[PDB]
Design a protein around this ligand. Structure first.
Ligand SMILES: CN(C)[C@@H]1C(O)=C(C(N)=O)C(=O)[C@@]2(O)C(=O)C[C@@H]([C@]3(C)OC(=O)c4c(O)ccc(Cl)c43)C[C@@H]12
Ligand SMILES: CN(C)[C@@H]1C(O)=C(C(N)=O)C(=O)[C@@]2(O)C(=O)C[C@@H]([C@]3(C)OC(=O)c4c(O)ccc(Cl)c43)C[C@@H]12
Ligand SMILES: [Cl-]
Ligand SMILES: [Cl-]
Ligand SMILES: [Cl-]
Ligand SMILES: [Cl-]
Ligand SMILES: [Cl-]
Ligand SMILES: [Cl-]
Ligand SMILES: [Cl-]
Ligand SMILES: [Cl-]
Ligand SMILES: [Cl-]
Ligand SMILES: [Cl-]
Lengths: 198, 198
């Protein structure tokens, strides 16, 4: 079939949903695409290059709240950005594990730059703007990885018995949205404080 | 050599540091222990059982701040507990990835139960006590996984150029400790607020 980049990635995402990350391999991708392995090699050199590319495309395709809206508060931006990120990572099996193993590529350069500019434009130091954005990223990745790794390993004292029932009410969206507000407020308190002891 | 549980786990942790998680296998563990694979099988049925056991032992061996000190505030406990957890996960290559794929086993039952009791004893609902503890866990796991997955994939616009230099000052300990305070304060604001709009 077609072996342009878009088509290769489509097939690889499809395979990722079928196999998970650990079971994703260039060999199986070749089969999915009806080609021989050396033909695939011309296009895709190894699994690492594949994964690097999938991370980028997962977000490009599905992380639709990369940038602040006109007039938007930084609180609101961070909330909307976290929810978008989380959505995009949940979209494919092992999506968060695919995203972990990567740094921003060129075309994300400009998206993350803007986000850091925006933070600095709202009273954050580069560093604190960065810590904020990274805390949100880490919290979100950590939380998605625990849904996704939960359900992957699948295939009592009373409070805990009940915590584990409450912790399975929904997918983790409640505990995530609650924590996200906590984190944002925490940032706000810090920003506000300037040099006052806080 | 000796194939009691303790000895098997010691060798497996040692192998984990040598190979990483993806490259850890029962076959290689057998070799490390100078035994044949079917001999290992008697003791260790597969990689999943191994990993389950490693997660438990990583924390048992190294997560030394599982419980609040007498008189300790819940703020302080959460801080000390997060720092302990983080330390323990960083101790072995792919430590956080090893921890992800697991639920508390029996002997952790009582440790996590206590922690949730303690939260409830300090004014939290079970649920909020739970969200707090899980937000901390997810933030910490997310942050460690990003150190560990960073260095594993290894083997510019100006703000970002500089964010990436600042983001490599230390291992991630600064950005983690900063975010942790933000998260704790966020929790405190929530607890304090009771039913007031906040
Ligand atoms: C979820 N958001 C907060 C960010 C985001 O919106 C994007 C995105 N592509 O639109 C990211 O790449 C993020 O989701 C994201 O994963 C990256 C992350 C950050 C700070 O920027 C980086 O370039 C970078 C890095 O190289 C290593 C670690 C970390 Cl935490 C980062 C910024 C993230
Ligand atoms: C880092 N700490 C906050 C906790 C902790 O001290 C321990 C520990 N063994 O001492 C945990 O197991 C923790 O580090 C930990 O990883 C678990 C975590 C929690 C809420 O309890 C659970 O039993 C549980 C679960 O089954 C699934 C997801 C989550 Cl987030 C959890 C509690 C964690
Ligand atoms: Cl075709
Ligand atoms: Cl075409
Ligand atoms: Cl083609
Ligand atoms: Cl294309
Ligand atoms: Cl390969
Ligand atoms: Cl011996
Ligand atoms: Cl002995
Ligand atoms: Cl023996
Ligand atoms: Cl033993
Ligand atoms: Cl196996």
């Amino acid at each position: 079939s077609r072996l342009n980049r878009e088509s290769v990635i489509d097939a690889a995402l499809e395979l990722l949903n079928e196999t998970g990350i650990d079971g994703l391999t260039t060999r199986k991708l070749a089969q999915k695409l009806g080609i021989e392995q050396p033909t695939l090699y011309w296009h895709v050199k190894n699994k690492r290059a594949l994964l690097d590319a999938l991370a980028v495309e997962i977000l490009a395709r599905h992380h639709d709240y990369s940038l602040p809206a006109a007039g938007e508060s930084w609180q609101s931006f961070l909330r909307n950005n976290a929810m978008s990120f989380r959505r995009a990572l949940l979209r494919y099996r092992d999506g968060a594990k695919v995203a972990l193993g990567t740094r921003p590529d060129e075309k994300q350069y400009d998206t993350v730059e803007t986000q850091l500019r925006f933070m600095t434009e709202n009273g954050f130091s580069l560093r604190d703007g960065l810590y904020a954005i990274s805390a949100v990223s880490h919290f979100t990745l950590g939380a998605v990885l625990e849904q996704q790794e939960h359900t992957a390993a699948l295939t009592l004292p009373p409070l805990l018995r009940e915590a584990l029932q409450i912790m399975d009410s929904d997918d983790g969206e409640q505990a995530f949205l609650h924590g996200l507000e906590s984190l944002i407020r925490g940032f706000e308190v810090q920003l506000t404080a300037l040099l006052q002891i806080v």
